[PDB]
Design a protein around this ligand. Sequence first.
Ligand SMILES: [Cl-]
Ligand SMILES: [Cl-]
Length: 162
Amino acid sequence: MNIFEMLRIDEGLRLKIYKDTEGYYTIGIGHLLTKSPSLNAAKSELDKAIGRNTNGVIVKDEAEKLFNQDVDAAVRGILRNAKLKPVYDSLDAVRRAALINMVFQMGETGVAGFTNSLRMLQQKRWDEAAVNLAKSRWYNQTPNRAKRVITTFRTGTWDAYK
Ligand SMILES: [Cl-]
Ligand SMILES: [Cl-]
């Protein structure tokens, strides 16, 4: 298992514009298009993102390409972030995948706000971090995915994904 396969399980793949769990226009493998209610604003962003007139639909390769950019940006955002970097540097390979996943879903800003959990992760207090991570809107809104990520943090293994 690796970050790509992990996120592909959590996000799914859709070749036509769809609405995410929050109701926003998304396409491919969790690629957020816009927070705007307009389907046209969404089609516009999509065409801009792909470099062609897509009429709201893309092929697998296009979805994969977006996904490759998005993971890359997630990692780079973590490395550029003063609060996230030290956490990431301190973690083992599996757990790093768990942080990348949160970042991809919720953005650098949002993860960076989990101040207390971040401090627990850095200290390697697994069980406590898992408890603290659960007291969040994140966990209440997408409990199955949150549980998988949290288990990854607690255990340091890919069990929740097998
Ligand atoms: Cl883009
Ligand atoms: Cl869920």
